[PDB]
Amino acid sequence: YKTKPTHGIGKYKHLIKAEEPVRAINLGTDYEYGVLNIHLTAYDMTLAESYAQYVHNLCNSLSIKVEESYAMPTKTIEVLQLQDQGSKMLLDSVLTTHERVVQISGLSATFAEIFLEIIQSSLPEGVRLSVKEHTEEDFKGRFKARPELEELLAKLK
Amino acid sequence: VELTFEETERRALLLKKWSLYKQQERKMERDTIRAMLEAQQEALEELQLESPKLHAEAIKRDPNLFPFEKEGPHYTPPIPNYQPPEGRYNDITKVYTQVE
Amino acid sequence: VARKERGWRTVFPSREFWHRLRVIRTQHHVEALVEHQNGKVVVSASTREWAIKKHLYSTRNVVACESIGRVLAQRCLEAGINFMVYQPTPWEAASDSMKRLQSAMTEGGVVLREPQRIYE
Amino acid sequence: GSPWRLLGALCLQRPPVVSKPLTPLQEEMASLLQQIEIERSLYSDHELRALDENQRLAKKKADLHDEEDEQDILLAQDLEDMWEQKFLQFKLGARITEADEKNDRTSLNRKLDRNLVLLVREKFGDQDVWILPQAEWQPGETLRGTAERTLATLSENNMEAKFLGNAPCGHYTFKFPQAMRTESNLGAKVFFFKALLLTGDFSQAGNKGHHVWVTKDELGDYLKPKYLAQVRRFVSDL
Amino acid sequence: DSSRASLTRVHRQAYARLYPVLLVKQDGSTI
Amino acid sequence: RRTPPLGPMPNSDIDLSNLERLEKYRSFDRYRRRAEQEAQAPHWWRTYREYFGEKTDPKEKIDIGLPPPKVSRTQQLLERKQAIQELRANVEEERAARLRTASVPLDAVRAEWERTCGPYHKQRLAEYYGLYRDLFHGATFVPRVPLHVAYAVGEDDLMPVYCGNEVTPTEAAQAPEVTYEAEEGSLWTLLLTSLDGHLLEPDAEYLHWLLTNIPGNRVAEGQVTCPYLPPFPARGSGIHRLAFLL
Amino acid sequence: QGIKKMEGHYVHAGNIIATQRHFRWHPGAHVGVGKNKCLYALEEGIVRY
RNA sequence: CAGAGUGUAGCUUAACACAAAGCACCCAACUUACACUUAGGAGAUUUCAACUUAACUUGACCGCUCUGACCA
Ligand SMILES: [K+]
Ligand SMILES: [K+]
Structure with a gap:
């Protein structure tokens, strides 16, 4: 009850973050980096997935917030080879490239050196690491191309 | 193919060692x-x-x-x-387009 | 004929019992308690006890949970406790450990349901 | 000014070139993982063709029906035989190089699996000492900028190093051994900055024998005991 | 080490058998 | 109008500035464990325990029993660890545990339990049954001498008396067979009382059996101060308690 | 809608203690809750909050 | 090398004895992953002597952390 000393003993919504029903990218401060994308590209899907899982768990151990973990679309490349004593290129192998992204935020300026050293030492063979700064173009690149909008936009041009 | 008792026993003991090695x-x-x-x-x-x-x-x-x-x-x-063999790389990734 | 503590319908677990089986599982040990609704422990079985630990390869596995049920069932009969309620969570009830611990208690003689109060 | 002389050292490291050999337990786990993956997988296209091919060959023997069998010119096992021949003809690069057998601790090519650290010998007070490359800080320069300068001062070096952050990863504080102790010049304070060796190496004249690339285990032979203790804290061997 | 997270299997329910192969690059290095 | 809290309010030590960085429960079981701990702590507001909890006296219960036995913890711990190492070393033990076919010997467990934690468990159970409250007006003792009372039923069977197990008046028609571990030259007194049997007076008891100056554990040679009377719980009066006090 | 029996009031079995559109007061010992969130006494005794 | 402080596995003012506890931690399955849950895994009193008590107290013996000498 309001008048009583126990007023507000049942308050609980100040202990929970407010819920709001795309996302603004937070540029880092002078002493902390902004949202960082950790791309992991491998010719083998299991190695990329396994290392992406290692990076996610490592960040949890270090109390680095993982904004999102997601896969980028697979890229298939046919590998043709010039035949012996011939001018015709024949299909040799089909190689698929698999990419996984672990998006982190709030990395410290000083601790960045230690974090990067750990995640490069454990890099498996054939897996490329690319830590970039998140941009809208990266997020938009995950969405299907809209041909109708391009034609209507071309008319305006 | 069903595994033999010794095989299932060997696989269980190996995984027990794996927990300590990874620890x-x-x-x-x-x-x-x-x-x-x-x-x-x-x-x-x-x-x-x-x-x-x-x-x-x-x-x-x-x-x-x-x-x-x-x-x-x-x-x-x-x-x-x-010297690597001569050849070409032909990307064959499907392009997905959203209509409607 | 004794009153059970009815009510508490919006919270968990219920209070409407005379005796309840309460199982505490920790990182290293398994403890099972029979306690009255008033909060007094009546009988107990824990893998921390040397009497039980000395016969167990591990004190944290399904075998330990089944062993605790068997030991507790015997102690219940000697104390005169033939009925109690067990109030597991959904994941606890589905677990093999708790299913084996419950079978041990029922095989040991203890019934894990309580007779209804007689009002008239 | 201050009594302590500000110094900036550089911990230039060549990261492992090749993967590290699997240990006995890792090899056992790798074999089990491969076995489990084969057991739980579906038949591959290659396997189905081999099964189909064997079945048709039996059909051709038991029955006279042929169905063209144009693809039967080559079998799936025949292809496997050709694939193995080309593999046995190709010779792989040596993971253990000549510098590992000759024990030339001046070349990068040695010890491909492990990480290497650069050590340069510098003469102080008519005495030769092994230390990480260092330079003396000068006004109008960040402390890391002093480490960036150490590379330029190196003798006939063509190497591009990638510096990680601006903060130092260690420090060693020593005092002169009473020969030149003075209030103005009490001692020195070196601060280490880690870098990665992207590409490059020393030239022949720079390979005069006054530097070694050494792993963390064999790092003590060169570095002095007190100096070794402060360098073995930020130099990982994971 | 490179072996920290390299010991894996295909974590799928339905997948065709895959075979280990050496990919020789254009500089002669393999993976 | 407001009134300041009379003490620290719940959820006060939580830092609300760093809410996003603070660790969350994430599991129902971790909240419940903390919630159960909070419920047991004393509070300055009105609580269910205040109105329904039994009003225990603040002064501790006087101990009137035998002195605790002296044990060398170091030697005991060393021997216990050695035993576990030997048990775990056996390969057959590990496979039985892994395949969930292992079991404990209940007879051996009870024998060891009787030597070690038995007395404290008997004290806890005796307190729950109200024996200390009624017999000694709240004073408690640890029953450090195990007492084995068994009513001979038939010629080949026994009805053991434990700590609240039901024994019918027919089974208790004759005096029970009492055996305990006693040294030579010691003296003991055994009595049997019905806490609830008394008909006329609520607080009084009935002395069913009294044996005094028992030499060692030879109960038969003790003086029969009071002869044995079988229990006579009246019809419709409920379940009575009969306690053997050595 | 509100409290029908305040602190310290004697209630008989069945007596509605309170009525509420939402769970302002939760049922405790010997207090039942109706389909419409109505709190009623399950025993004869004294109401306590 | 000297002088101080210091002592349970990662943390704990866990440890009355009935007992070296609770949590943190590692693997597998589930999960894109994380998380949860299930089923498993690994652990400690630095070492001896003193009502034998003693993880606890006093001593040495070890490891540790600082303060100086040594130091390029
Ligand atoms: K009576
Ligand atoms: K209502």
Whole structure:
């Protein structure tokens, strides 16, 4: 009850973050980096997935917030080879490239050196690491191309 | 194919060893981060006492650190004089378009 | 004919019992308690006890949970406790450990339901 | 000014070139993982063709029906035989190089699996000492900028190093051994900065024998005991 | 080490058998 | 109008500035464990325990029993660890545990339990049954001498008396067979009382059996101060308690 | 809608203690809750909050 | 090498004895992953002597952390 000393003993919504029903990218401060994308590209899907899982768990151990973990679309490349004593290129192998992204935020300026050293030492063979700064173009690149909008936009041009 | 009792027993015992082996990798990796962090923090504290201005510059973020790209180790090293076959790369990735 | 503590319908677990089986599982040990609704422990079986630990390869596995049920069932009969309620969570009830611990208690003689109060 | 002389050292490291050999337990786990993956997988296209091919060959023997069998010119096992021949003809690069057998601790090519650290010998007070490359800080320069300068001062070096952050990863504080102790010049304070060796190496004249690339285990032979203890804290061997 | 997270299997329910192969690059290095 | 709290309010030590960085429960079981701990702590507001909890006296219960036995913890711990190492070393033990076919010997467990934690468990159970409250007006003792009372039923069977197990008046028609571990030259007194049997007076008891100056554990040679009377719980009066006090 | 029996009030079995559109007061010992969130006494005794 | 402080596995003012506890931690399955849950895994009193008590107290013996000498 309001008048009583126990007023507000049942308050609980100040202990929970407010819920709001795309996302603004937070540029880092002078002493902390902004949202960082950790791309992991491998010719083998299991190695990329396994290392992406290692990076996610490592960040949890270090109390680095993982904004999102997601896969980028697979890229298939046919590998043709010039035949012996011939001018015709024949299909040799089909190689698929698999990419996984672990998006982190709030990395410290000083601790960045230690974090990067750990995640490069454990890099498996054939897996490329690319830590970039998140941009809208990266997020938009995950969405299907809209041909109708391009034609209507071309008319305006 | 159903596994034999000895096979299922051998697989269970191997996994039990795997739990302890992986526990000790994490410890070595968890004691390395701690050592690095302590050394860095101790050095920075020593650098603030000696010269505060340099310490202020040291703790700032580096604009040139990212993009940071590192390829993983190879299985065998590059061959000094190896000639790869001639060929072409033809991307055959499907393009997905949203209509409506 | 004794009153059970009815009510508490919006919270968990219920208070409408005379005796309840309460199982505490920790990182290293398994403890099972029979306690009255007033909060007094009546009988107990824990893997921390040397009497039980000396016969167990592990004190944290399904076998330990089944062993605790068997030991507790015997102690219940000697104390005169033939009925109690067990109030597991959904994941606890589905677990093999708790299913084996419950079978041990029922095989040991203890019934894990309580007779209804007689009001008239 | 201050009594302590500000110094900036550089911990230039060559990251492992090749993967590290699997230990006995890792090899056992790798074999089990491969076995489990084969057991739980579906038949591959290659396997189905081999099964189909064997079945048709039996059909051709038991029955006279042929169905063209144009693809039967080559069998799936025949293809496997050709694939193995080309593999046995290709010779892989040596993971253990000549510098590992000759024990030339001046070349990068040695010890491909492990990480290497650069050590340069510098003469102080008519005495030769092994230390990480260092330079003396000068006004109008960040402390890391002093480490960036150490590379330029190196003798006939063509190497591009990538510096990680601006904060130092360690420090070593020593005092002169009473020969030149003075209030103005009490001692020195080196601060180490880690870098990665992207590409490059020393030239022949720079390979005069006054530097070694050494792993962390064999790092003590060169570095002095007190110096070794402060360098073995930020130099990982994971 | 590179073996920290390299010991894996295909974590799928339905997948065709895959075979280990050496990919020889254009400089002669393999993976 | 407001009134300041009379003490620290719940959820006060939580730092609300760093809410996003604070660790969350994430599991129902971790909240419940903390919630159960909070419920047991004393509070300055009105609580269910205040109105329904039994009003225990603040002064501790006087101990009137035998002195605790002296044990060398170091030697005991060393021997216990050695035993576990031997048990775990056996390969057959590991496989039985892994395949969930292992079991414990209940007879051996009870024998060891009777030597070690038995007395404290008997004290806890005796307190729950109200024996200390009624017999000694709240004073408690640890029953450090195990007492084995068994009513001979038939010629080949026994009805053991434990700590609240039901024994019918027909089974208790004759005096029970009482055996305990006693040294030579010691003296003991055994009595049997019905706490609830008394008909006329609520607080009084009935002395069914009294044996005094028992030499060692030879109960038959003790003086029969009071002869044995079988229990006579009246019809419709409920379940009575009969306690053997050595 | 509100409290029908305040602190210290004697209630008989069945007596509605309170009526509420939402769970302002939760049922405790010997207090039943109706389909419409109505709190009623399950025993004869004294109401306590 | 000297002088101080210091002592349970990662943390704990866990440890009355009935007992070296609770949490943190590692693997597998589930999960894109994380998380949860299930089923498993690994652990400690630095070492001896003193009502034998003693993880606890006093001593040495070890490891540790600082303060000096040594130091490029
Ligand atoms: K009576
Ligand atoms: K209502």
